[PDB]
């Protein structure tokens, strides 16, 4: 839900960056912070799932 | 492109991809499927 349902509210902003074109005040950067959060969110889940391969054997 | 030897040598068109499968198979079909009524 944070990796999908948050995507559409994040990926509407590039369609909001399309004006079109161009009557709306620019620039605006919506890239952060969800992108890097979901990155680290996998970094939490990948190395915690490595506990299967790390702890065991 | 146009270099090398490149230059040297809804719609119904979209449905025609599926429609041609009707041409070589089972016609449409009404009459035959309508004849199958009294067959058995």
């Amino acid at each position: 839900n944070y990796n999908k349902a948050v995507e559409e509210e994040d990926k509407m902003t590039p369609e909001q960056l399309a004006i079109k074109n161009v009557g709306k005040q620019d620039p605006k950067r919506h890239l952060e912070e969800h992108v890097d959060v979901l990155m680290t969110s996998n970094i939490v889940q990948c190395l915690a799932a490595m506990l299967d391969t790390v702890v065991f054997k | 492109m146009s270099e090398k030897k490149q230059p040297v040598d809804e719609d119904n068109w979209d449905d025609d991809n599926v429609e041609d499968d009707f041409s070589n198979q089972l016609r449409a079909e009404l009459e035959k499927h309508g004849y199958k009524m009294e067959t058995s």
Partner: protein, 378 residues
């Protein structure tokens, strides 16, 4: 002022596929020639139907009386422009002179459409143009003119509201949605139903009910299929008047497959003998089958085709190649065992194959921005 000539287009398809009656279609065509002053309607029918003998002076004194009625409207252009008024002078040279398109060919059409187009201050007169472009494109099978005028009709007339002629547009594009292939928007624009009531351009509303009910058995899903007819008030009384259509509607919900092959042929008879349904009936046949076969195979995980012979009455080798040609085309993926008389369900689309739309459509997507990334720079 359409249906009398709009039925000549019905006579064209009545002459087109069946060759049986050439006299019955030419009598009411000549009856439509002796009235309404039709010229080209019997000229393009003169090649399809019999070449008489003689029409000529019988219908030439008409086109002369037409010319007398054409010249008096062409005399009305410089007689009314002698005075001055807003839109009133040149409004007489559109509706009746584009009624001369109904007389013959495109001469009345093309020259009277653009000649009156710039003056009109009201959207109702601009749509009468678009109207008469839709009838000539119904008469002659050319699909060009009826696509462009509707695009011009949506911009100007919809600005803006109207009750009457705007509901006709939703019928036109809906009729265009069934003229070309669109299932979902056909019945969606037909949702207006009796709000359009009956008009010269709406022909018989009971026939308009037949047009929307035949698309509503595919595009309108089974939960919504029974909903629109039963919960819908104004649409329910007109379907109960027809015992043939209402039967097949409820029998579809009753799931009995014995009455389908009979009643579906009755619908196909109307689908065969109606214009603009000739290219579109081929996929319509087995699309109502898979619609009945969708709920079929969803019922049991293991089903014997001999039990299907009961309902089908009696499918043995018929559904053997039939259901096999459904799977090969991607319609209703299923496993039916041969000579073992078992059908297997499946296919669990809730997990595996449903994931594939992500990367597959995302391949050409990301590929398009790979190549176009190497373009910047150079």
């Amino acid at each position: 002022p359409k249906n009398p000539d709009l039925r000549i287009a019905q006579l064209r398809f009545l002459l087109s596929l069946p060759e049986h009656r050439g006299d019955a279609a030419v009598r009411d065509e000549l009856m439509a020639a002796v009235r309404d002053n039709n010229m080209a309607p019997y000229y393009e029918a003169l090649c399809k139907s019999l070449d008489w003998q003689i029409d000529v002076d019988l219908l030439n004194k008409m086109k002369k009386a037409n010319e007398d009625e054409l010249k008096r409207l062409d005399e009305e252009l410089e007689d009314a422009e002698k005075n001055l008024g807003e839109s009133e002078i040149r409004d007489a040279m559109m509706a009746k002179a584009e009624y001369l398109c109904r007389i013959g060919d495109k001469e009345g059409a093309l020259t009277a459409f653009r000649k009156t187009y710039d003056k009109t201050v009201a959207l109702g007169h601009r749509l009468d143009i678009v109207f008469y472009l839709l009838r000539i494109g119904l008469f002659y099978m050319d699909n060009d003119l009826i696509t462009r005028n509707t695009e011009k009709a949506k911009s100007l007339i919809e600005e803006g509201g109207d009750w009457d002629r705007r509901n006709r547009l939703k019928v036109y594009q809906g009729l265009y949605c069934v003229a070309i292939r669109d299932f979902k928007q056909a019945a969606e624009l037909f949702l207006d139903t009796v709000s359009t009531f009956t008009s010269y351009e709406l022909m018989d509303y009971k026939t308009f009910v037949t047009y929307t009910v035949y698309v509503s058995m595919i595009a309108l899903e089974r939960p919504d299929l029974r909903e629109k007819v039963i919960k819908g008030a104004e649409i329910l009384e007109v379907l109960h008047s027809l015992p043939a259509v209402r039967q097949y509607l409820f029998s579809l919900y009753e799931c009995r497959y014995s009455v389908f092959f009979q009643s579906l042929a009755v619908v196909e008879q109307e689908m065969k003998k109606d214009w603009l349904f000739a290219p579109h009936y081929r996929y319509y046949v087995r699309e109502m089958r898979i619609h009945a076969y969708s709920q079929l195979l969803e019922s049991y995980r293991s089903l014997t085709l001999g039990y299907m012979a009961e309902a089908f009455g009696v499918g043995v080798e018929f559904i053997d190649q039939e259901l096999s040609r459904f799977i090969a085309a991607g319609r209703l993926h299923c496993k039916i065992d041969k000579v073992n008389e078992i059908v297997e369900t499946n296919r669990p689309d809730s997990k595996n194959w449903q994931y594939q739309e992500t990367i597959k459509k995302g391949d050409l997507l990301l590929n398009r921005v790979q190549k176009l990334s190497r373009v910047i720079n150079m």
